[PDB]
Amino acid sequence: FRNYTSGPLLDRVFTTYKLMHTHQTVDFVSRKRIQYGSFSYKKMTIMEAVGMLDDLVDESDPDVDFPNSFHAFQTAEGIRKAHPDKDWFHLVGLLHDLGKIMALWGEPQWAVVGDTFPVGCRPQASVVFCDSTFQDNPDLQDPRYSTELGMYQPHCGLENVLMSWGHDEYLYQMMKFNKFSLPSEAFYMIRFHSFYPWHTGGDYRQLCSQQDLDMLPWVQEFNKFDLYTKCPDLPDVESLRPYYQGLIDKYCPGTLSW
């Protein structure tokens, strides 16, 4: 499945989980939201950004030791074959992990990729490596953040929660700034696709609004393709490019701000 008890990749993902749960604090996320929130680093098309990820392997992913750009196409393809009628959703597959361009810009990987969690409240039991990787996090020594709800009001809504910083929130905010013309569902899925304690573990319902609950099956449906299309046998990217460019032209055309 996705194996955190066995695997030939488990040490590197154990390091990045340990480093991520150590340094992802309320302060850190507040800093990074500003650092990236103006989308002033680069100008690029989707396929340019996709190609940039020809240069990136994920250290938090125990299912995968090849360029992450191949996984973009694999996820897109899996979705396209299961949901022929929803082209916007094919594209969400191609797009979802494009926020990882941040690791090519010198961000450490624990600050880019990986299962997300809410920062500013106590980590819940389904956070990977929760029992063993949070003891050097300064926020857990802070009474403002060490309780179940921490800085949050019950059922505030995930859109009102400060998530540990990485690819999902970067891309969510990117797509708003660039005004992608995808459905609300698309933005939501990308923004919370890493939030495994929530969509897979049964955790963080204290923070959920009814709207979040309603979105859960969409993110669970996205997640099964994100996860299970991961395979060493790679797509014919050159073959597929025209199809995806056609969707890019419809939903998020031209040079974009990153």
Contact (CB, 8 A) for 99 and 33: no
Residue span 177-206 as binding mask against ligand OH, x where in contact by CB under 6 A, dash where not:
----------------x-------------
Sequence-distant (6+) residues with CB within 8 A of 68 are 53, 56, 57, 58, 97, 100
Binding-site partner at residue 203 among ligand INS, Fe ion, ligand OH, none, CB < 5 to 8 Å by type: none
With H, G, I as helix, E, B as strand and everything else as coil, classify residue 202. coil
Q: Which two tokens stand for residue 112?
A: 């880019």
Q: Which two tokens stand for residue 147?
A: 């309780």
Residue 208, phi-psi category: left (phi > 0), alpha (psi -120 to 50), beta (remainder): beta
Residues 83-102 that bind ligand OH (CB under 6 A): 96-97
| Contact pick of 74, 169, 226, 230 for Fe ion (by CB under 5 A) | 226
114 makes contact with ligand INS (CB under 6 A): yes
With H, G, I as helix, E, B as strand and everything else as coil, classify residue 128. coil
Smaller CB distance to ligand OH: residue 96 or 191? 96
With H, G, I as helix, E, B as strand and everything else as coil, classify residue 118. strand
Binding-site partner at residue 60 among Fe ion, ligand INS, ligand OH, none, CB < 5 to 8 Å by type: ligand INS
Q: Is the dihedral of CA 190, 192, 196, 201 positive or negative?
A: negative
- Pick the stretch among 19-27, 29-37, 87-95, 97-105 that binds Fe ion (CB under 5 A): 97-105
83 is annotated as contributing to ligand binding? no
| Shortest spacing between CB 12 and ligand OH, in angstroms | 17
249 is annotated as contributing to ligand binding? no
Q: Which helix (H) or strand (E) holds 44?
A: strand 43-44
Residues 210-239 that bind ligand OH (CB under 6 A): 226
Residue with structure tokens 């800093």?
A: 31
Q: Which residues bind Fe ion (CB under 5 A)?
A: 97, 226
| Numbered residues of the known binding site | 2, 58-61, 71, 96-97, 100, 114-115, 167, 193-194, 226
Q: Which residues bind ligand OH (CB under 6 A)?
A: 96-97, 193, 226
Q: Which residues bind ligand INS (CB under 6 A)?
A: 58, 60-61, 97, 113-115, 193-194, 196
